[PDB]
Every structure is written in C-alpha cells, then in structure tokens.
Short mmCIF file of C-alpha atoms and ligand atoms in Angstrom, two decimals:
data_model
loop_
_atom_site.label_atom_id
_atom_site.label_comp_id
_atom_site.label_asym_id
_atom_site.label_seq_id
_atom_site.Cartn_x
_atom_site.Cartn_y
_atom_site.Cartn_z
CA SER N 4 16.58 -10.67 9.73
CA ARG N 5 14.78 -13.75 8.22
CA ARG N 6 17.99 -15.55 7.00
CA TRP N 7 16.83 -18.74 8.93
CA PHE N 8 14.30 -19.38 6.12
CA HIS N 9 15.61 -21.59 3.30
CA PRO N 10 13.19 -21.65 0.28
CA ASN N 11 14.72 -24.36 -1.99
CA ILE N 12 16.15 -27.04 0.38
CA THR N 13 15.00 -30.63 1.10
CA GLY N 14 14.84 -32.39 4.51
CA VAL N 15 18.19 -34.15 3.74
CA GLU N 16 19.99 -30.88 2.80
CA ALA N 17 18.50 -29.32 6.02
CA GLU N 18 19.78 -32.25 8.12
CA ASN N 19 23.30 -32.07 6.53
CA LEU N 20 23.34 -28.21 6.83
CA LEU N 21 22.55 -28.39 10.56
CA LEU N 22 24.96 -31.30 11.25
CA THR N 23 28.04 -29.92 9.42
CA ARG N 24 27.47 -26.10 9.72
CA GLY N 25 25.40 -25.82 12.93
CA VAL N 26 25.62 -26.63 16.66
CA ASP N 27 23.07 -27.76 19.30
CA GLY N 28 20.38 -25.06 19.26
CA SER N 29 20.87 -24.37 15.52
CA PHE N 30 17.64 -24.04 13.58
CA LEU N 31 16.08 -23.32 10.18
CA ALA N 32 12.57 -23.21 8.69
CA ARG N 33 11.63 -24.33 5.16
CA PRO N 34 8.69 -25.08 2.81
CA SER N 35 7.57 -28.75 2.31
CA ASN N 38 3.04 -31.85 1.09
CA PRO N 39 3.36 -28.31 -0.51
CA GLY N 40 1.59 -25.51 1.44
CA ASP N 41 3.16 -26.80 4.74
CA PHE N 42 6.43 -25.81 6.50
CA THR N 43 9.13 -27.51 8.58
CA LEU N 44 11.12 -26.14 11.48
CA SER N 45 14.42 -28.24 11.48
CA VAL N 46 16.30 -27.97 14.85
CA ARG N 47 19.63 -29.50 15.99
CA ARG N 48 19.36 -30.88 19.60
CA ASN N 49 21.88 -33.30 21.29
CA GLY N 50 23.75 -34.13 18.02
CA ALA N 51 20.53 -35.02 16.13
CA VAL N 52 18.07 -33.04 13.90
CA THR N 53 14.36 -32.81 14.98
CA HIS N 54 11.82 -31.92 12.23
CA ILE N 55 8.69 -30.02 13.44
CA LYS N 56 5.60 -29.60 11.25
CA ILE N 57 4.01 -26.17 10.64
CA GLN N 58 0.61 -26.19 8.92
CA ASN N 59 -1.27 -23.29 7.32
CA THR N 60 -4.58 -23.88 5.50
CA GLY N 61 -5.28 -20.14 5.45
CA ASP N 62 -6.04 -19.02 9.05
CA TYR N 63 -2.68 -19.19 10.97
CA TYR N 64 0.69 -20.99 11.21
CA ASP N 65 -0.01 -24.08 13.34
CA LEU N 66 3.18 -25.50 14.88
CA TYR N 67 3.18 -29.17 16.08
CA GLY N 68 3.79 -29.30 19.87
CA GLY N 69 3.63 -25.49 19.91
CA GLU N 70 1.21 -22.62 19.33
CA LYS N 71 -0.68 -20.87 16.43
CA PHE N 72 1.05 -17.76 14.95
CA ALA N 73 0.34 -14.94 12.49
CA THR N 74 3.78 -15.14 10.71
CA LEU N 75 6.91 -17.40 10.72
CA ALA N 76 8.94 -14.37 11.96
CA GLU N 77 6.51 -13.92 14.93
CA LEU N 78 6.78 -17.66 15.65
CA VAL N 79 10.66 -17.57 15.59
CA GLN N 80 10.79 -14.28 17.58
CA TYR N 81 8.52 -15.81 20.26
CA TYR N 82 10.39 -19.15 20.77
CA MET N 83 13.80 -17.40 20.66
CA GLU N 84 12.48 -15.28 23.64
CA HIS N 85 10.22 -17.78 25.57
CA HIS N 86 12.21 -20.96 26.38
CA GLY N 87 10.56 -24.16 27.69
CA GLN N 88 7.56 -23.53 25.39
CA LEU N 89 8.58 -25.88 22.51
CA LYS N 90 8.43 -29.68 23.21
CA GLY N 94 7.88 -33.79 25.83
CA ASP N 95 11.55 -32.70 25.97
CA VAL N 96 12.18 -28.93 25.47
CA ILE N 97 13.47 -27.84 22.02
CA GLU N 98 15.48 -24.58 22.08
CA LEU N 99 15.77 -22.21 19.05
CA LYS N 100 19.17 -20.65 19.77
CA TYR N 101 21.12 -20.07 16.54
CA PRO N 102 19.46 -19.24 13.22
CA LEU N 103 21.25 -21.13 10.43
CA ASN N 104 21.56 -18.49 7.70
CA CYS N 105 20.59 -19.03 4.07
CA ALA N 106 22.89 -17.69 1.32
CA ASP N 107 20.27 -18.26 -1.49
CA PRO N 108 19.17 -14.93 -3.13
CA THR N 109 15.85 -16.24 -4.72
CA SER N 110 13.48 -14.48 -2.20
CA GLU N 111 15.37 -11.09 -2.33
CA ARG N 112 13.42 -8.20 -3.96
CA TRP N 113 16.41 -7.17 -6.11
CA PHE N 114 17.44 -10.67 -7.42
CA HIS N 115 16.36 -11.24 -11.05
CA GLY N 116 18.42 -14.37 -11.94
CA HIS N 117 18.30 -14.99 -15.72
CA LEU N 118 17.75 -11.44 -17.11
CA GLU N 124 18.56 -1.83 -18.67
CA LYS N 125 15.10 -1.49 -20.42
CA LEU N 126 13.44 -2.03 -16.97
CA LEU N 127 15.71 0.51 -15.14
CA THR N 128 15.15 3.08 -17.96
CA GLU N 129 11.34 2.57 -17.99
CA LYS N 130 10.49 1.79 -14.31
CA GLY N 131 13.62 2.95 -12.43
CA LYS N 132 14.51 6.15 -10.54
CA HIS N 133 17.70 7.45 -8.77
CA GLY N 134 19.05 4.52 -6.71
CA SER N 135 16.93 1.75 -8.30
CA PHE N 136 18.95 -1.47 -8.50
CA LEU N 137 18.88 -5.16 -9.39
CA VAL N 138 21.22 -8.20 -9.42
CA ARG N 139 21.21 -10.72 -12.32
CA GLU N 140 23.32 -13.74 -13.33
CA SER N 141 26.02 -12.94 -15.97
CA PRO N 145 29.07 -17.23 -16.64
CA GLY N 146 28.60 -18.22 -12.97
CA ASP N 147 29.29 -14.53 -12.11
CA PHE N 148 26.65 -11.81 -11.40
CA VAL N 149 25.89 -8.20 -12.43
CA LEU N 150 24.81 -5.26 -10.22
CA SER N 151 22.83 -2.75 -12.34
CA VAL N 152 22.04 0.68 -10.71
CA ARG N 153 20.25 3.78 -11.99
CA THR N 154 21.46 7.23 -10.81
CA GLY N 155 20.11 10.72 -11.59
CA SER N 166 20.27 10.08 -15.38
CA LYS N 167 22.26 6.88 -16.32
CA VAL N 168 22.68 3.07 -15.72
CA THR N 169 25.94 1.58 -14.26
CA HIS N 170 26.82 -2.13 -14.39
CA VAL N 171 29.18 -3.55 -11.70
CA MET N 172 30.46 -7.09 -12.20
CA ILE N 173 30.15 -9.50 -9.25
CA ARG N 174 32.75 -12.25 -9.36
CA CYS N 175 32.05 -15.58 -7.73
CA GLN N 176 35.35 -17.23 -6.69
CA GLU N 177 35.29 -20.26 -4.30
CA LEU N 178 31.72 -19.67 -2.95
CA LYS N 179 32.55 -15.99 -2.20
CA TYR N 180 31.34 -12.78 -3.91
CA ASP N 181 33.33 -9.60 -4.65
CA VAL N 182 33.20 -6.40 -6.78
CA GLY N 183 36.84 -6.88 -7.98
CA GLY N 184 38.61 -5.83 -4.77
CA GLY N 185 38.25 -5.39 -1.02
CA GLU N 186 36.02 -7.77 0.96
CA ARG N 187 34.85 -11.23 -0.24
CA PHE N 188 31.22 -11.98 0.87
CA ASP N 189 29.52 -15.34 1.69
CA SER N 190 26.33 -14.34 -0.20
CA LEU N 191 25.01 -11.78 -2.72
CA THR N 192 22.86 -10.50 0.23
CA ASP N 193 25.94 -9.70 2.38
CA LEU N 194 27.55 -7.87 -0.62
CA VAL N 195 24.30 -5.96 -1.39
CA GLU N 196 23.82 -5.00 2.35
CA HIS N 197 27.49 -3.85 2.54
CA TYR N 198 27.36 -1.68 -0.64
CA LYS N 199 23.92 -0.37 0.49
CA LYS N 200 25.52 1.05 3.75
CA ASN N 201 28.93 1.88 2.12
CA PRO N 202 28.19 2.98 -1.51
CA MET N 203 30.74 2.48 -4.29
CA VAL N 204 32.02 5.86 -5.56
CA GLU N 205 32.97 6.22 -9.23
CA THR N 206 36.44 7.78 -9.91
CA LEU N 207 34.70 11.06 -11.07
CA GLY N 208 32.35 11.17 -8.04
CA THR N 209 29.09 9.36 -8.96
CA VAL N 210 27.87 7.74 -5.70
CA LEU N 211 26.32 4.34 -6.63
CA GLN N 212 23.54 4.49 -4.00
CA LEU N 213 21.42 1.33 -3.71
CA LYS N 214 18.26 3.22 -2.60
CA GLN N 215 15.44 0.84 -3.50
CA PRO N 216 15.12 -2.43 -5.54
CA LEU N 217 13.70 -1.96 -9.06
CA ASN N 218 9.87 -2.36 -8.97
CA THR N 219 8.81 -5.27 -11.21
CA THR N 220 5.49 -6.11 -9.41
CA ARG N 221 3.52 -2.90 -10.18
CA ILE N 222 1.37 -3.66 -13.23
CA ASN N 223 -1.13 -1.69 -15.23
CA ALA N 224 -4.63 -3.07 -14.29
CA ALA N 225 -5.59 -3.69 -17.95
CA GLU N 226 -2.51 -6.03 -18.29
CA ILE N 227 -3.48 -8.40 -15.33
CA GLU N 228 -4.21 -11.45 -17.63
CA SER N 229 -0.66 -11.09 -19.06
CA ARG N 230 0.90 -10.94 -15.55
CA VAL N 231 -1.23 -13.96 -14.33
CA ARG N 232 0.07 -15.97 -17.40
CA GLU N 233 3.73 -15.07 -16.59
CA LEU N 234 3.24 -15.85 -12.83
CA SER N 235 1.64 -19.21 -13.72
CA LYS N 236 4.87 -20.30 -15.56
CA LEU N 237 7.34 -22.61 -13.68
CA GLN N 246 5.51 -21.26 -10.28
CA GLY N 247 6.19 -17.48 -10.46
CA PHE N 248 3.31 -16.94 -7.95
CA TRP N 249 5.32 -18.95 -5.33
CA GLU N 250 8.53 -16.85 -5.88
CA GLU N 251 6.67 -13.49 -5.67
CA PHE N 252 4.78 -14.63 -2.52
CA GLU N 253 7.95 -15.95 -0.80
CA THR N 254 9.75 -12.64 -1.60
CA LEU N 255 6.83 -10.86 0.19
CA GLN N 256 7.16 -13.36 3.07
CA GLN N 257 10.85 -12.43 3.41
CA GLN N 258 9.83 -8.80 4.17
CA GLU N 259 7.71 -9.79 7.20
CA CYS N 260 10.80 -9.44 9.55
CA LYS N 261 10.28 -5.59 9.19
CA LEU N 262 6.79 -5.88 10.73
CA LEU N 263 7.58 -7.10 14.25
CA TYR N 264 5.82 -4.12 15.99
CA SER N 265 4.91 -4.24 19.69
CA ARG N 266 1.80 -6.18 20.68
CA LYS N 267 2.19 -5.31 24.44
CA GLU N 268 -1.45 -4.44 25.29
CA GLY N 269 -2.65 -7.87 24.08
CA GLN N 270 -0.14 -9.55 26.49
CA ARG N 271 -1.49 -7.85 29.64
CA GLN N 272 -2.86 -10.29 32.25
CA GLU N 273 -6.41 -8.92 31.95
CA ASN N 274 -6.33 -9.12 28.07
CA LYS N 275 -5.11 -12.75 27.66
CA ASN N 276 -8.64 -14.31 27.71
CA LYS N 277 -9.83 -11.66 25.18
CA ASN N 278 -7.64 -13.31 22.46
CA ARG N 279 -8.92 -16.31 20.48
CA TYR N 280 -5.26 -17.33 19.93
CA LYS N 281 -2.91 -16.20 22.76
CA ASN N 282 -0.01 -15.52 20.33
CA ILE N 283 -2.06 -13.81 17.53
CA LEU N 284 -2.19 -10.24 18.79
CA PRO N 285 -3.13 -6.79 17.49
CA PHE N 286 -0.33 -4.17 16.93
CA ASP N 287 -0.57 -1.49 19.69
CA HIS N 288 -0.05 1.32 17.15
CA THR N 289 -3.21 0.38 15.13
CA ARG N 290 -5.33 -1.54 17.71
CA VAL N 291 -8.92 -0.34 18.29
CA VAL N 292 -9.00 1.45 21.72
CA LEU N 293 -12.41 1.15 23.47
CA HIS N 294 -13.41 4.26 25.41
CA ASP N 295 -16.98 3.15 26.46
CA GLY N 296 -15.35 2.17 29.82
CA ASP N 297 -17.24 0.60 32.73
CA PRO N 298 -15.51 2.22 35.81
CA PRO N 301 -10.46 -1.46 35.25
CA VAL N 302 -9.12 -2.66 31.85
CA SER N 303 -12.08 -1.99 29.58
CA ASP N 304 -10.16 -0.61 26.51
CA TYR N 305 -9.07 -3.85 24.72
CA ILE N 306 -10.32 -5.83 21.75
CA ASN N 307 -8.30 -8.09 19.39
CA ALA N 308 -8.91 -5.77 16.38
CA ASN N 309 -6.92 -3.25 14.24
CA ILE N 310 -7.86 -0.24 12.04
CA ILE N 311 -6.83 -0.97 8.39
CA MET N 312 -6.33 2.21 6.23
CA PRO N 313 -5.95 1.74 2.45
CA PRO N 324 -13.20 6.22 8.25
CA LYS N 325 -15.68 5.49 5.42
CA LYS N 326 -13.22 3.51 3.27
CA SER N 327 -11.29 2.03 6.19
CA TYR N 328 -11.71 -1.41 7.78
CA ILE N 329 -11.48 -2.98 11.16
CA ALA N 330 -9.85 -6.44 10.87
CA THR N 331 -10.83 -8.51 13.90
CA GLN N 332 -11.08 -12.06 15.26
CA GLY N 333 -14.23 -14.17 15.61
CA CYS N 334 -16.03 -13.24 18.88
CA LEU N 335 -15.50 -15.21 22.05
CA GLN N 336 -18.41 -15.56 24.53
CA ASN N 337 -16.52 -13.09 26.80
CA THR N 338 -15.80 -10.54 23.98
CA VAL N 339 -19.32 -10.20 22.49
CA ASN N 340 -20.00 -7.09 24.58
CA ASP N 341 -16.61 -5.58 23.55
CA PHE N 342 -17.37 -6.32 19.87
CA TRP N 343 -20.67 -4.34 20.08
CA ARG N 344 -18.94 -1.46 21.97
CA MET N 345 -16.37 -1.37 19.08
CA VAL N 346 -19.07 -1.38 16.32
CA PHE N 347 -20.96 1.43 18.16
CA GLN N 348 -17.92 3.60 19.00
CA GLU N 349 -16.47 3.40 15.44
CA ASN N 350 -19.88 4.09 13.78
CA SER N 351 -19.47 0.93 11.62
CA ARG N 352 -22.62 0.19 9.58
CA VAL N 353 -21.39 -2.94 7.78
CA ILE N 354 -19.94 -6.22 9.13
CA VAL N 355 -18.36 -8.85 6.88
CA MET N 356 -18.25 -12.30 8.44
CA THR N 357 -16.14 -14.79 6.38
CA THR N 358 -16.47 -17.95 8.49
CA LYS N 359 -19.28 -20.29 9.61
CA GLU N 360 -19.81 -20.26 13.38
CA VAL N 361 -18.47 -23.83 13.41
CA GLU N 362 -15.99 -25.40 10.99
CA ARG N 363 -14.61 -29.00 11.30
CA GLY N 364 -16.38 -29.40 14.65
CA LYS N 365 -14.50 -26.36 16.10
CA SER N 366 -16.03 -23.01 17.20
CA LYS N 367 -14.66 -20.19 14.93
CA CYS N 368 -16.96 -17.32 16.07
CA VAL N 369 -19.73 -17.27 18.64
CA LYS N 370 -23.20 -16.12 17.47
CA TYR N 371 -22.98 -12.45 18.54
CA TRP N 372 -26.28 -11.44 16.85
CA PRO N 373 -29.89 -12.27 17.93
CA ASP N 374 -32.21 -14.73 16.08
CA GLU N 375 -34.38 -13.12 13.37
CA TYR N 376 -37.12 -10.83 14.86
CA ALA N 377 -35.48 -11.04 18.34
CA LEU N 378 -34.05 -8.27 20.56
CA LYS N 379 -31.01 -8.84 22.81
CA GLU N 380 -28.88 -6.76 25.22
CA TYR N 381 -25.08 -7.22 25.14
CA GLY N 382 -23.97 -5.16 28.10
CA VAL N 383 -24.96 -1.49 27.51
CA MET N 384 -25.63 -2.25 23.79
CA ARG N 385 -28.97 -3.44 22.40
CA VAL N 386 -29.31 -5.31 19.09
CA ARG N 387 -32.48 -6.20 17.19
CA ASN N 388 -32.28 -8.63 14.21
CA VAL N 389 -34.89 -7.02 11.93
CA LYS N 390 -34.71 -9.38 8.95
CA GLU N 391 -32.46 -12.06 7.43
CA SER N 392 -32.12 -12.55 3.64
CA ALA N 393 -30.50 -15.68 2.20
CA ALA N 394 -28.49 -15.46 -1.07
CA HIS N 395 -26.49 -18.35 -2.64
CA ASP N 396 -23.06 -17.71 -1.00
CA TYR N 397 -24.16 -15.54 1.92
CA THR N 398 -26.82 -14.38 4.36
CA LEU N 399 -27.61 -10.71 5.01
CA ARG N 400 -28.86 -9.82 8.52
CA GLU N 401 -30.38 -6.38 9.06
CA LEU N 402 -29.46 -5.38 12.58
CA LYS N 403 -30.48 -2.34 14.65
CA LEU N 404 -27.81 -1.33 17.19
CA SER N 405 -28.39 1.22 19.96
CA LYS N 406 -27.08 2.05 23.42
CA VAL N 407 -29.42 1.09 26.31
CA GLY N 408 -31.20 4.19 27.79
CA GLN N 409 -30.57 6.23 24.60
CA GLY N 410 -33.18 5.70 21.86
CA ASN N 411 -31.71 8.35 19.48
CA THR N 412 -28.37 6.42 19.17
CA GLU N 413 -30.04 3.76 16.95
CA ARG N 414 -28.40 2.87 13.61
CA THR N 415 -28.79 -0.03 11.23
CA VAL N 416 -25.83 -2.45 11.00
CA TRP N 417 -25.82 -4.71 7.92
CA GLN N 418 -24.25 -8.11 8.52
CA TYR N 419 -22.93 -9.87 5.43
CA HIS N 420 -22.25 -13.43 6.42
CA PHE N 421 -20.27 -15.35 3.70
CA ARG N 422 -21.14 -19.02 4.29
CA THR N 423 -19.56 -20.98 1.40
CA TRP N 424 -15.78 -20.45 1.87
CA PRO N 425 -14.18 -24.01 1.97
CA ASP N 426 -12.79 -25.48 5.28
CA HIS N 427 -9.20 -25.43 3.77
CA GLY N 428 -7.74 -23.54 0.80
CA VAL N 429 -9.68 -21.01 -1.26
CA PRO N 430 -12.75 -21.04 -3.61
CA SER N 431 -11.93 -22.49 -7.06
CA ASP N 432 -13.76 -19.48 -8.73
CA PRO N 433 -13.68 -15.83 -7.37
CA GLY N 434 -17.12 -14.83 -8.83
CA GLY N 435 -19.01 -15.49 -5.57
CA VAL N 436 -16.52 -13.45 -3.47
CA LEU N 437 -16.55 -10.53 -6.01
CA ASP N 438 -20.38 -10.46 -6.27
CA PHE N 439 -20.49 -10.43 -2.41
CA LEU N 440 -17.82 -7.64 -2.12
CA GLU N 441 -19.64 -5.61 -4.83
CA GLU N 442 -22.83 -5.80 -2.67
CA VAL N 443 -20.90 -4.84 0.54
CA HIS N 444 -19.25 -1.95 -1.26
CA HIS N 445 -22.62 -0.51 -2.48
CA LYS N 446 -24.25 -0.90 0.95
CA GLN N 447 -21.23 0.93 2.48
CA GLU N 448 -21.27 3.71 -0.24
CA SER N 449 -25.07 4.33 0.27
CA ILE N 450 -24.66 5.12 4.01
CA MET N 451 -23.74 8.72 4.79
CA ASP N 452 -20.76 9.07 7.19
CA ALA N 453 -20.54 5.26 7.77
CA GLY N 454 -17.52 4.29 9.91
CA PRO N 455 -14.97 1.58 8.94
CA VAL N 456 -16.22 -1.76 7.55
CA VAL N 457 -15.85 -4.54 10.16
CA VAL N 458 -14.28 -7.70 8.70
CA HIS N 459 -13.66 -10.92 10.68
CA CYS N 460 -13.06 -14.69 10.26
CA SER N 461 -11.56 -16.96 13.03
CA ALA N 462 -8.12 -15.32 13.80
CA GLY N 463 -8.98 -12.31 11.60
CA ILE N 464 -5.83 -12.42 9.46
CA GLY N 465 -6.23 -14.93 6.58
CA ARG N 466 -9.67 -14.77 4.98
CA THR N 467 -10.00 -11.33 6.64
CA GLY N 468 -6.81 -9.99 5.00
CA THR N 469 -7.73 -11.69 1.67
CA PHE N 470 -11.24 -10.03 1.50
CA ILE N 471 -9.75 -6.63 2.59
CA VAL N 472 -6.83 -6.75 0.05
CA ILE N 473 -9.28 -7.72 -2.84
CA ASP N 474 -11.63 -4.90 -1.71
CA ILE N 475 -8.71 -2.35 -1.69
CA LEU N 476 -7.40 -3.40 -5.15
CA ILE N 477 -10.85 -3.44 -6.71
CA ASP N 478 -11.57 0.03 -5.23
CA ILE N 479 -8.55 1.51 -7.15
CA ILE N 480 -10.07 0.13 -10.41
CA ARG N 481 -13.48 1.70 -9.43
CA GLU N 482 -11.96 5.16 -8.85
CA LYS N 483 -9.11 5.34 -11.43
CA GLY N 484 -10.44 2.84 -14.05
CA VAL N 485 -8.90 -0.05 -16.09
CA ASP N 486 -5.89 2.25 -16.87
CA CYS N 487 -4.48 2.36 -13.32
CA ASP N 488 -1.41 0.89 -11.62
CA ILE N 489 -1.86 -1.98 -9.16
CA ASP N 490 0.91 -3.52 -7.03
CA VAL N 491 -0.43 -6.62 -5.13
CA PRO N 492 2.58 -7.33 -2.71
CA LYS N 493 2.87 -3.55 -2.10
CA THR N 494 -0.81 -3.42 -1.04
CA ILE N 495 -0.39 -6.60 1.08
CA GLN N 496 2.79 -5.27 2.84
CA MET N 497 0.92 -1.99 3.60
CA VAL N 498 -2.00 -3.98 5.17
CA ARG N 499 0.40 -6.28 7.09
CA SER N 500 2.04 -3.26 8.85
CA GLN N 501 -1.46 -2.58 10.32
CA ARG N 502 -2.27 -6.19 11.52
CA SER N 503 0.03 -9.23 11.70
CA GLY N 504 -0.03 -11.76 8.85
CA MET N 505 -2.85 -10.24 6.80
CA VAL N 506 -3.05 -12.76 3.84
CA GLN N 507 -1.78 -16.11 5.16
CA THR N 508 -1.08 -18.36 2.19
CA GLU N 509 0.16 -18.58 -1.39
CA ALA N 510 -3.31 -19.99 -2.32
CA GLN N 511 -4.95 -16.71 -1.02
CA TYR N 512 -2.19 -14.69 -2.81
CA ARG N 513 -3.06 -16.42 -6.13
CA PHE N 514 -6.78 -15.96 -5.24
CA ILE N 515 -6.30 -12.15 -4.97
CA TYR N 516 -4.68 -12.03 -8.46
CA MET N 517 -7.51 -14.30 -9.82
CA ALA N 518 -10.18 -12.04 -8.23
CA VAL N 519 -8.68 -8.80 -9.64
CA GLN N 520 -8.35 -10.56 -13.09
CA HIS N 521 -12.05 -11.63 -12.92
CA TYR N 522 -13.21 -8.10 -11.91
CA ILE N 523 -11.35 -6.54 -14.95
CA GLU N 524 -12.70 -9.28 -17.35
CA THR N 525 -16.33 -8.40 -16.30
CA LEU N 526 -15.70 -4.64 -16.81
C1 LIG E 601 9.86 -2.94 18.42
O1 LIG E 601 9.16 -4.18 18.56
C2 LIG E 601 8.69 -4.55 19.81
C3 LIG E 601 8.85 -3.79 21.02
C4 LIG E 601 8.32 -4.26 22.25
C5 LIG E 601 7.65 -5.50 22.29
C6 LIG E 601 7.46 -6.25 21.10
C7 LIG E 601 6.78 -7.54 21.14
N1 LIG E 601 5.44 -7.60 21.04
N2 LIG E 601 5.10 -8.94 21.11
C8 LIG E 601 6.26 -9.59 21.21
N3 LIG E 601 6.40 -11.01 21.32
C9 LIG E 601 5.17 -11.80 21.20
C10 LIG E 601 4.52 -12.29 22.49
C11 LIG E 601 5.06 -11.98 23.77
C12 LIG E 601 4.44 -12.51 24.93
C13 LIG E 601 3.29 -13.33 24.81
C14 LIG E 601 2.77 -13.64 23.53
C15 LIG E 601 3.39 -13.12 22.37
CL1 LIG E 601 2.79 -13.49 20.79
C16 LIG E 601 7.61 -11.63 21.40
O2 LIG E 601 7.73 -12.86 21.58
C17 LIG E 601 8.82 -10.72 21.43
C18 LIG E 601 10.12 -11.27 21.60
C19 LIG E 601 11.27 -10.45 21.61
C20 LIG E 601 11.12 -9.05 21.49
C21 LIG E 601 9.83 -8.47 21.37
C22 LIG E 601 8.67 -9.29 21.35
N4 LIG E 601 7.33 -8.79 21.19
C23 LIG E 601 7.99 -5.79 19.87
O3 LIG E 601 7.81 -6.54 18.73
C1 LIG E 602 12.36 -12.64 -9.06
C2 LIG E 602 12.23 -12.04 -7.62
N1 LIG E 602 13.33 -12.65 -6.83
C3 LIG E 602 10.86 -12.50 -7.00
C4 LIG E 602 9.62 -11.57 -7.24
N2 LIG E 602 10.04 -10.17 -7.11
C5 LIG E 602 9.47 -9.33 -6.18
C6 LIG E 602 9.82 -7.97 -6.08
N3 LIG E 602 9.22 -7.19 -5.15
C7 LIG E 602 8.26 -7.67 -4.32
C8 LIG E 602 7.59 -6.70 -3.41
C9 LIG E 602 6.87 -5.62 -3.96
C10 LIG E 602 6.29 -4.64 -3.13
C11 LIG E 602 6.39 -4.78 -1.73
C12 LIG E 602 7.07 -5.89 -1.20
CL1 LIG E 602 7.26 -6.10 0.52
C13 LIG E 602 7.69 -6.83 -2.02
CL2 LIG E 602 8.58 -8.13 -1.27
C14 LIG E 602 7.85 -9.01 -4.45
N4 LIG E 602 6.93 -9.57 -3.64
N5 LIG E 602 8.47 -9.79 -5.37
C15 LIG E 602 11.10 -9.70 -8.02
C16 LIG E 602 12.40 -10.48 -7.69
#
C-alpha cells in the first residue's frame, strides 16, 4: 500500500496528525515550493521534516539517497535501518491517509460514462449531501449504492462501518454485495476516464488545465506505483554495485538487459532495461560510468541497436551525468573487445548527430553503423517551454530507425535513465500510435506510463514531464 502519502495536507496538519494519531516511528510523505516533497517523521515526541527534491531525474532525499519512486524510497528505509540521519531517523509506522482524491475510482462532484465507457464490473464513487454514491455496471445495467457518512465512518446501510471510502471499496471488492435476486455487484475495474480519442487532445488539455487537473491525474498515477515494487536483486550483488550511477536506482531483474559477451566472473550486468510498447522496442539505461563504457558497447552490439538517444549533456551544473563513451570525430577507439569509429558529426539547433561505426575486434564483418542523437538543449531543471524541438528530434530518430532493416531496440539514456529517458520514450510510444492508427485513435497517457514503469522503475519522474507529454502529443496532432 501507499496510504502513507497525503496529497492535500500542510506541514501543520502533518505535525498534528503525527502527534495526536501517531507514535515514535510514525511517518508520512506529502507534496510541498511546489514540485518538492516532505517526509514528516515522529521521533522522541517531536516531528522531523525531511526534504525530497525532484527536478526530473530522481527523488533526492536530504540526509539520504536518490530514488526512482517514493514507494521505493519508503520500502528501502523501512527495510534498511541506520541509513536515514546525524541521529538515526526510523520509518516504522506508516500514518495512513483516508483522503480518496488520488484513487482511480473517486470522481467527487459528478451513468452516461458507465453506459458509454463502462463494461461488466466498471465502477466509480461520487459525492451525493455529505454522503457518497457507488455506481457499478454489470452485464447490462447500472446499480447505485448509497454510501452514508455518519461520524467520520462510511457504510452501505448495514454491517461494517469503515474509516475511509478506500476501506469500504477494498472490502466490497473482496466481498461483493449480492442483490436480493442474485446480481453480484463485482467491483472489477475502475471506470476509465483517461482514455481519450487523439483528435480530442486539445479539449482534454483544456479540462486538465482547470483548477490543476494535471496534478490530480498525475498523483493518481503516482498512487499506483506501490504495485511496481519488483525485485532488483541482480543490481544489489557485490560485484554490480559500482556499475550503478545511483546505488538505489536499479533495473528490474525481469526486464534487465543480460550481457552474454562474457569474459571468462560477473560479466552479465548493466543498469538497463528492455522497454516494449525488437525494432520498435527501447533500452532505457543510465549515463555511462568510466567503468561501464565497455559494458554499454557490449549491450549495443549484442542487441543490434542502430540508434542511441542521449538526452543529457556530459556535464550539467558542474556534475558528470554521462562519460564521453564515443570517440572524437574522425577517431577510432577500442572499448574492450568492441571498436568504435566516429565517422562524422552533424550539428543541428537542439542536437548533434554522430555517425558511429561499431564492430567487434578481430571480426571485420560484424561492422554496423550506430547513429547517436545527442539532444543538447534540455534545461538543467524542469522541461522545455515548447515541445517542437523534442518532436522534430524524435521524428528524425524515428525515420532513421524505420530506414534500417532489422534494427534492434533504440537505446535511450539520460543521467539515471528514468526521467528524461521515460519522457522521450512515452512521447515516442504515443506518437507512434497516431502514426499507425491516425488522428482517430484512442490514447491513454497514464495507462502508457504505468505500462512503461512496470519495465523500469520511475519512468517519467515529475508532473512537469507528465504535462510535457500531453503538450507534445497535442503539438504533434496540431501539425498533422
Ligand atoms: C516481489 O518484490 C521483491 C522480491 C525480492 C526483492 C525485492 C527488492 N528488490 N530491491 C529491493 N529493495 C531495494 C534495495 C535493496 C538493497 C540495496 C539497494 C536497494 Cl534500492 C528494498 O529495499 C526491498 C525491501 C523490502 C523487500 C524487498 C526489497 N527489494 C522485491 O521488490
Ligand atoms: C478524479 C480522479 N480521482 C483523478 C484522475 N483519474 C484517474 C483515473 N485513472 C488513472 C489511471 C489510468 C490508467 C492507468 C493508471 Cl495506473 C491510472 Cl492511475 C489516472 N491516472 N487518473 C480519475 C479519478
């Protein structure tokens, strides 16, 4: 669960919540300077507030580490004590949130939708006077169940009285209400309200811009991240620790890229994952370390990747984000058993193209051209104010990829390989649907993001990137 995340509370409410309803070791996380987060922890009778920053690359915890998601952060500290400080701060008891705002099925102030979009078991919860309504489709028909709110507790007119709409929903999801004549009121899935028809994007962007709707949709997607805590065991192995740019930002074992080139001990690891929406697949990876440059070229060669998308400068804010893993123009370099020639570099406004020739040493016939698209103008923090540059760049990448027969997955990387990486990949997936199926196609942005996030942790980091994806898709349809 992710009940420890409270979306609409202040620092004062948080302090009072932890003092009156918590104990020592009680904790909660909350949004702020908007775009930032706070981890509020009770310790020795008093509340400590810890800053969490995210400008688009990772969740940066003060006095702690950098993480892909808030759920990964909480899971880690609840399992590794003595790590948060210089007195140790323990995350023992999540203080649960009763607010239903970030639930997929909660539609506050709101049958047309269930008739049009719904299927058997599609449900929603709306506010009635102070009471709520549970509307379910079965088949086919729609049934409305009244939810009474009496002294901070919720009930369906008998039986148990719940502390939150969530507890009631979870209960009647496991134990369905049966109508007198036998209709089982199964709460299968929440009603889909995010899937839009591509041609109606401008309309959706207008409605999400109203007091904002983009924040509520993004935070509802963030609440689903607790379902994506897959094992990242291989990246924890002693011999793999120095192969990670950020020790706690790890690739899922079920999608990680396994290297078989193998110098005959532990030669099979790279912090990278296959992303499936081979030719229209991606590899989402981190910016190279000096000790992973050889592994990066073994991955590119093994996977038959012909295109690399680099979305960071080598150095940003005086910090190394990616080592230069390619030779200077006209130069030839050996990176272990791999040989790379930089044939030619071409400078465009927002990016540089580098034509590379990759081959395995001692095997001339293994040579293939690798096109490196280096996006150089992405700001240090936040996102571009206009998506035109990113779309023009992606259009170019897409055509290069399409022109190459049996090209392997597109390699995409930034610093941690989750924020800008996930943003470019999600835009590229969404735009590809519009290429294939046309302006009259269905697109579902959080659905696409959730699908990508089950393949690599925290793909798409911020609300700013989330709004950027909608803005990019809107701009691509406007130029069609
Ligand atoms: C079905 O799911 C799983 C099955 C097996 C292992 C994992 C697993 N993989 N990584 C972690 N890390 C993350 C982690 C660990 C050590 C060093 C750095 C990091 Cl960043 C935890 O802190 C953790 C804590 C509690 C439980 C599982 C955890 N876990 C998993 O999720
Ligand atoms: C008003 C409201 N409480 C906030 C917006 N809203 C929703 C609904 N569903 C998703 C969704 C869609 C597909 C996959 C995933 Cl994982 C998610 Cl979470 C979403 N992000 N927001 C409707 C309810």
